[PDB]
Symmetry: D4
Subunit: 158 residues, 8 copies
C-alpha cells in the first residue's frame, strides 16, 4: 500500500513531478501518482486530502505552477505533512508558484522545495527522510543514496 | 433586502482593507452580506459558502486575502458566479505575494483582481456595482451620478 | 448585436487575445474584436469607450503589454465593467503589463486577469459569468462548460 | 511671462513630490504653469490640455503620477511636445509600479523618465531647462552657473 | 525528556522570530533543545551539531536564518534527518534574500521551507509535529485537537 | 554637421541602438553614431561629453546594458540633455540596465526610455521632439511621422 | 603613516553606512584616508583620484554609493588597483538599485561587491584587510586574532 | 605552485567558470581548478578552505548557482580573500545565486562579481589586481592587459 501520495495540477506538471516519482521508485517507497487540480476539481481535492491519513498515506507531495493553491488547500484538510513543489511558470518563472506556496499562514504548514525539477527531487528525498525515522531498512537505503551522491562528485571539470 | 453581493475575507485583520468595499456598497444602496471565511482554517466553510452562493441569490462575490491568498481562487472553483479578488497588503512582501496568488489563475477559473490594498477594495465594490448596473437602471443611474461627482470634485491646481 | 467588445493594442496582441475570441465564440456570445491603441490612437480609444454603453456593449475586454494603459484609459470613459489582460512583454515577462493594469486608483476599476493566454481565456469566461446573471440560456451553456472542464481532468499523468 | 513649461500631476498627494520641479523652474526663472490632471477621473480634461499645449506656447511638459501611472504616457499620445515623466513613490510597491507604468512606452510615443520621487521631480525640471537652454542663451548661462555651483559645493571629506 | 527536535538559529536577533517555534513545541509537549549556531562565525560548531544529530536522538531539525541564510542548507548537508528552514525577515530586502537562500536547494539535499518570519517559525514547529505524529499516537491526538480548535476559533463575521 | 550624438557601450548594443539611427535617418536629422564604453574607455567618454556642446551637438542619446553607467557619466560632463536607453541584458532582462540609468540623483538628469529597441526608437523620437521646438521644417516632418503612425493602425487582427 | 586604503563615498549621507568601514580599518591599525567623491557632481575629481591612487601608494579602494551607484565602477575604470564596492541602501528600492548598479560590471573591469548597508561596509574593510594581509604578517596575525574572537564570542543558546 | 584556487559546485558551472580559468592562464597565474560542492561534499569544502592558506593559495574564486552557499561557507574557514561568482540559474536567472552570495553578514566577507561569465572573468581579473600588489611582473602584464582592452574598443558599430 502507498505511503506517499504525489499529486499535481495538470499533465504539464508531469515534466517536473516525474523526478519525484523516479526517486521514490529508486528508494523503493510505495507511492501513488495522481492528477488533482485545486481549481478545476476542488471536490476531488477535498476528498483526496480529507481521506489521506485513513488510507495510510504518511506524506503528501503536491506540485503546481502559477497561482499554485494545490499544496496549501491540501494541507487545510489533513494533519499529514504536506510538501510543496513550485512548478516553473511560463512568464514569471515560478516566482508566482513559489510565493503562492511558501507563504502559508501560521497554523497550516506546507514544507516548500525549490522551483522546478530540483524541488520535485527534493520533495521525494524529504519524504524519504521522514519515513526513514521509523523504517530502519529505508533509513539504510537512504544513507546509501546520500553517500553515493557525495562520493560521485568529480574533483575537476571536463 | 436579500443580499446580492457577498464580501468575504480571510481574517479580522483583513477588515482594515475590506471595510472600504463594505462602505462603498452601502453608499450605492447595494444589499450585501459581510463574512469571514478562512480558506485554510475553515476550508469546509469555504466550500459550502461558494457552492450555495448562486441558489441563495448572490450575483457577485468580493473576496479579500493576503500572503498565500487562496481565498478568491478557491471560491471561484466552486461557483459559476463572478468572483472579484482583492490583494491585501502583507507585511514582508508588501502584497506582492497576495497579488501573484490571486491574479495568476489558470485558464478556466477566473478571478477579476483589483489593486493591492484599500484602492482595490474600493474598486471591487465599484466593479460589482458596474456589473449589477447592467440589469438595474436605478443603480446604473446612481452609479453614473457617482462617477460624475468624482470627476467634478477633482481640483484644477494644487495647494502649496 | 455584439455585447462584449474585445480590444487590443496591436496585431502582436492577437497571439494572446485570440484565446478570448475563441471562448466567446464557443459560448455563442455576440462580440466584436478590434485593435485600439491607447498611445497611437488615443482619440479612437476615447470614442470607442465613451460610446460603448449606448451601442449595447455590456462588458469590455482589453489586452495590452508593456506600459499597458489601454484597459485603464478605457475604464476612465465608460461605466461599463472593463476587464484587463496583461500581455506578456519581451523583457519583463508581463510584469510591467501587470502592474500598469492592476494598480488602478480607487474610483475607476479594472478587473485584472493573469498574464498571457490564460488571462485572455479568463477575461472571456468572466464576461460570460457576468452575462450569465441575466441570460438564463447562456447561464446553462456556461455550467455545461465548467462541468466539462471539471470532468475532463485526468486522474493520472502519461 | 507666458508659460513655456507645464507641470501636471494626478492628485494633491503628488504635489509633495512635484513641488521640487516647481521650485526648481522658479529658481532658473523659467515661466511655467502648475496644474492637476487626473488621467482616470478627468480624462477629457487630459485630452484637451495635451492637444492644445503646443498652440498655447508650451515647449515641455513635466507630468507626475503614481501607481498605475498613465498620466505621462497619455499626454505624450496627444502632443508632439517632449513629455517628461516623474514616477511618484507608491505606498505598497515603493514606486516600482509607477516606474514600469511610465518608462515602458512603445516605440512611437516617448516619455523621458526620471528617478522615483523628489530626485526625479528635480531632474525633470533640470532636463526641461537643458532643453530650453538650446535656444535661450540667458537660460543656458544661468544653467551652467547652476551646474558649476553644485560641483563646487561638494565637500572633500565627510563629517564624523 | 531527551529532545527529539532541535531548533537552531544564526543569532540572538533571530530569536525574535524563532521563539514562536519554541513556544509551539512546548505547547504540544514535544521535547526539544534550542541553540545558536552561526554558519559563518561558528562553522565547525555547525558541522559537529549536524553530523551528530541523529546519533543523539533528534528526529527533526528546525533552522532559522536571515540574509545570505546558509544555516539550514549546510545543516541538511550533514544530516540524513529532515531539516526545516525558516527565512528570517531581513532589513533591506524584507526576507526575500533569506527565502531564495534557503528554498533554492539543489536536487539531493532538501530543506522544507516555511514562510518568511513568525508565520514560518510557527509552521516549522507544526510541520515537525505532523512529522513526529506519524509514529506517536498521543502527539497525533494532541495535534488534531489543536487543528480542530483553530478551526472552531475562527469567527463568522468581522468586527466593525 | 551632426546635432544628435548616438553612443553605445559595445558592438552588441548596435542590435538595439540601430533603431535609433534609423529613425534619425528617417527624419533627416544630422547625427553621428559611435561606440563609447564608460568602463573600458573612460577618458574617451569624458572627452566626448565635455566637448559635445561646443561641437554643436544639441542632444545625446546613450545606450548601455548591465551596470549601465554610460548615460549617467555622460550627463555629468555636459549641460546638454542626455537620453538613456537600457539595453536588455542576458540574465536580468534589462532590469539592471534600467535601474542603473533611471535612478540619477537630483542635479544631474538622464531622460530614460524603455528597455530595448522601443527605447532606442523613442530616444530618437524624443530628440526629434526637442529639436522640433526651434526647427520648423523638422517640426513638420515630425507631425507627418506621428500622424502616419496614428492612421496606420489597423482596426482588426489578422 | 601614509594611507594604503582609500575609503570614498558619494555624499555625507553615505557616511552613515561607510563609517563602519572606517572604524574597522582603524581597529586593525590599517592606515587609510576617507574622502567624498561624487561621480556625477564632481566627475573630474573622480578621474584624478582614481588615476593617481596607485602612484600615491594606495593598494585597495573602498567605494560606497547609492541609487544609480556609478562611483565604484567608474573608479575601477581608472585604476589597476582592486576596487571594492558597497551598495548604500536607498529609500525607495531599498538598495536593490544600488546593488545592480555596482555588482553587474562587464568583463574587464571588476568591482568586488559586498552586502547592502552597514554589513557590506564592514565586510569591505575586512576584505581589504584580508588582501593586505597577504604581504603583511603583523596585520595577518591581527586579522586571525580578530576572526578567532568573533568565533569565540558567539553564544551557545539564546536569551529568552 | 598554484596561488589562486578556482572552485565550482558542479560540472555545469564549468560553462561559466572556464572564463576565469582562461584569464588566469592568459596572465600566467599559477592556479588550480576544482569541483567542490558545499551541499553534496561539505567535508571536502571544509578541508579545502581550512587548508588553503598553508598550501600557498592567496585568493580563492568560488562559483555557484541557485542557493549558492559555496563562496560563503568557504570564507567561513579561511582568512584568505574569497571572490564569489553567481552562476546563472534556470528559473530565477541568477538572482537567487546573487542574493545568496552577496548578502554576507558583517564579519565574514565575500567579494561578489556579476552574474555569469562576466563575473567569472572579473573574479579572475580581481584576483590578478590583488596579486599585482606584490608581484611587479604580473603587475606589468596586467597593465598591458587593461591598456589593450581600452585601445581595442572600436569607434563605431558594424
Amino acid at each position: 500500500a502507498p505511503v506517499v501520495g504525489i499529486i499535481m495540477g495538470s499533465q504539464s506538471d508531469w515534466e517536473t513531478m516525474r523526478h519525484a516519482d523516479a526517486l521514490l521508485t529508486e528508494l523503493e517507497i510505495p507511492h501513488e501518482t495522481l492528477i488533482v487540480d485545486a481549481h478545476r476539481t476542488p471536490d476531488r481535492l477535498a476528498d483526496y486530502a480529507r481521506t489521506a491519513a485513513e488510507r495510510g498515506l504518511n506524506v503528501i507531495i503536491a506540485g503546481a505552477g502559477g497561482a499554485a493553491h494545490l499544496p496549501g488547500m491540501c494541507a487545510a484538510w489533513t494533519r499529514l505533512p504536506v510538501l510543496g513543489v513550485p512548478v516553473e511558470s511560463r512568464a514569471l518563472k515560478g516566482m508566482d508558484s513559489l510565493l503562492s506556496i511558501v507563504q502559508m499562514p501560521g497554523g497550516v504548514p506546507v514544507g516548500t522545495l525549490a522551483i522546478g525539477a530540483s524541488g520535485a527531487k527534493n520533495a521525494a528525498l524529504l519524504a524519504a527522510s521522514i519515513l526513514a525515522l521509523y523504517n530502519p531498512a529505508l533509513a539504510a537505503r537512504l544513507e546509501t543514496w546520500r553517500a553515493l551522491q557525495t562520493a560521485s562528485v568529480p574533483n575537476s571539470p571536463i
